[PDB]
Structures are given as structure tokens and as C-alpha cells.
Amino acid sequence: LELLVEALNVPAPQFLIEVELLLPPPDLASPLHCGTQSQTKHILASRCLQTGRAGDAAEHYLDLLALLLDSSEPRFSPPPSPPGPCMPEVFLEAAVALIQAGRAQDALTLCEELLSRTSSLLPKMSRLWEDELPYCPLWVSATHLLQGQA
Amino acid sequence: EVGKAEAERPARFLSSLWERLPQNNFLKVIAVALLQPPLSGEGSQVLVHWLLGNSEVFAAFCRALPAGLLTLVTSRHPALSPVYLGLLTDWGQRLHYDLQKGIWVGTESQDVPWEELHNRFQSLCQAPPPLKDKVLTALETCKAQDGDFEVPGLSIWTDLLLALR
Ligand SMILES: [Zn+2]
């Protein structure tokens, strides 16, 4: 998989009927389904995280995040697709590795940057004074759980 | 009349009363008696000594009346501020939170609910300056004793202090 990523780093149509014209675009169930750089790097970090190579996992995940967010200048480098996890389930997985490193003062510069971008959503918690009805996406409840373990 | 006589102390009279007549009625009388401006306030001054002397009746008093009544009791007679607050302190500390209904509730059926306790402190604060400071400080002190959390669901008393804005 490591090798995979560098592979995907590097990138003619005849006026004739060739085969690929008649070939389909493959599915996600295909063994010819290969995502993009970013999507994979995520796999690597994912797979790594399940094994218990937490530190390594982290570094992968940070590299993941570097890629996803910092990509203003070049060709865009995309997030993982939504049979997979959404952009906040990921940051969490970032911070969870950072906790299995014992990199807890990072794990917090993450859960800080998260709830800093996403202020401008959140539930503004006036039910705090009035105390089922308001809505909290699971991930915002959790950011707080892990800020905590940190 | 009994004061001028000095044969029996008002105490004995009010003890016998307490047995004899209907208590809810009685208390309201006494409550209002504490307030009537003077007619010869030795009268009011006697009732506070009776009350502070006998704790058990005074527990029922604070429990039976409305809030504004105890507020005015207090601002008039400061001898009642510190033990009344004492009784609230002592009721708050036999609650418990459940998470699933976002509310303080008591264990036992007779344990003055949240509703009632909010209200009386609501009032006591909604009072002249010489009591508001007293009570507000008596909150910050019982808060720190039960952990200085600044989030609900831990310290009954944090809860209250927040609930006052
Ligand atoms: Zn999600």
C-alpha cells in the first residue's frame, strides 16, 4: 500500500474503434477499482490503525490531512468517497491515533482546529438553560469525548 | 397581655397552640404577624426567638409558604436569613440528576423539587442588597465544596447560579 501511494503520484486517443471505447467504467465491487492518492493513503492509515501501529498510523493520518486541506496550489487531492467515512469521521481517526501515540497535546490542536471551522454549524446549546428535540450530529458529541480522553 | 403578665413565657403558649390548632393556617398567621408594623415590635421579636429555638416547626414553615413571604420575612428579620439558606443547602444535597430527562429530581416523594427550590432562590436573590450578596456568596461557597465545575450535570449549585441568567 505504501508503494501504491507513490505509484498513484505519477500519471493517446486514436480515431478508430479500439477496445477501451467498449470497455465499461468499473464499479466499486471490481478488483479494477483503484481510487486516488488521497483515498488510498486513507486506506493505509485505516488498515494500520486497526493493526495497532498507532504512531505510524498517526503520521499516515497527518499526511492524509496535510494532503486534503493544504491542496490550494496544485491539482486537487480529494477526500474519501461516502460508502467510506466523511471528512469529520476522518479527523477523529486522526486524533484517535494521536492518542495511541501518547501525542495528546497534538490530539487537542486537532479537536481545536475541528470545532474552530465548524462553530458556524453547531447546536448553540440554549437548551443548557431550559433543562430529544435539537439535533447534534454524532461526530460533534464525540469530538468532545476525545478532547476528554486527550 | 402575657408579656406584661410575665407569669408564663410566650414559648409555653405557642407550644400548646402548635398541638391544638391547624398548622397550615397557624403558620401563615405567624408569617404575616412578623410583618405588621408596631401597635403599642416586641411581638415580632418574640416569634423569631420561639422559631430559631424550635427547629422542627421552622422546617415546615419554609416548606409550607410561598417564596415572596419568606423573602420579606428575611429582609425585615435578618435572624432568619442564615438558617433558611441552611435548609436549602440541606435539601439541594439530597437530589440526584438522571441524564435521560435533563432535570434534577429527588429520591424521596416529599423532597422539595427542583421546581420549588429554583423558585425560592429566584426570590431570595430578587430582594434588597443586604441579603442578595449574602445568599449569592452562600452559593459560590457550597459550589466550590462540591467541585468547581462550570458545566451542568455535576454541581446542583453551579446549575442554580447559571439558571439565574
Ligand atoms: Zn460522518
From Swiss-Prot, chain A:
Self-association and partners: Belongs to the multisubunit FA complex composed of FANCA, FANCB, FANCC, FANCE, FANCF, FANCG, FANCL/PHF9 and FANCM. The complex is not found in FA patients. In complex with FANCF, FANCA and FANCL, but not with FANCC, nor FANCE, interacts with HES1; this interaction may be essential for the stability and nuclear localization of FA core complex proteins. The complex with FANCC and FANCG may also include EIF2AK2 and HSP70.
Q: What is the effect of changing residue 81 to A?
A: No effect on BRCA2-, FANCA-, FANCF-, nor XRCC3-binding
Tissues where the protein occurs: Highly expressed in testis and thymus. Found in lymphoblasts.
Per-repeat ranges for TPR: 38-71
Q: Where in the cell is it found?
A: Nucleus; Cytoplasm
Range covered out of full length: 303 to 462 of 622
Biological source species: Homo sapiens (Human)
The function of this protein is: DNA repair protein that may operate in a postreplication repair or a cell cycle checkpoint function. May be implicated in interstrand DNA cross-link repair and in the maintenance of normal chromosome stability. Candidate tumor suppressor gene.
The condition associated with this protein in its record is: Fanconi anemia complementation group G: A disorder affecting all bone marrow elements and resulting in anemia, leukopenia and thrombopenia. It is associated with cardiac, renal and limb malformations, dermal pigmentary changes, and a predisposition to the development of malignancies. At the cellular level it is associated with hypersensitivity to DNA-damaging agents, chromosomal instability (increased chromosome breakage) and defective DNA repair.
Q: What is the lineage of its organism?
A: Eukaryota, Metazoa, Chordata, Craniata, Vertebrata
Signal sequence annotation: none
Q: Give the superkingdom in one word.
A: Eukaryota
Q: What is this protein called?
A: Fanconi anemia group G protein
UniProtKB/Swiss-Prot annotation, chain B:
Q: What is the effect of changing residue 61 to R?
A: Reduced monoubiquitination of FANCD2
Taxonomically, which superkingdom?
Eukaryota
The record's subcellular locations are: Nucleus
Subunit text? Belongs to the multisubunit FA complex composed of FANCA, FANCB, FANCC, FANCE, FANCF, FANCG, FANCL/PHF9 and FANCM. The complex is not found in FA patients. In complex with FANCA, FANCG and FANCL, but not with FANCC, nor FANCE, interacts with HES1; this interaction may be essential for the stability and nuclear localization of FA core complex proteins.
Function as written in the Swiss-Prot or TrEMBL entry: DNA repair protein that may operate in a postreplication repair or a cell cycle checkpoint function. May be implicated in interstrand DNA cross-link repair and in the maintenance of normal chromosome stability.
Write down the disease named in this UniProt entry: Fanconi anemia complementation group F: A disorder affecting all bone marrow elements and resulting in anemia, leukopenia and thrombopenia. It is associated with cardiac, renal and limb malformations, dermal pigmentary changes, and a predisposition to the development of malignancies. At the cellular level it is associated with hypersensitivity to DNA-damaging agents, chromosomal instability (increased chromosome breakage) and defective DNA repair.
Name the record gives this protein: Fanconi anemia group F protein
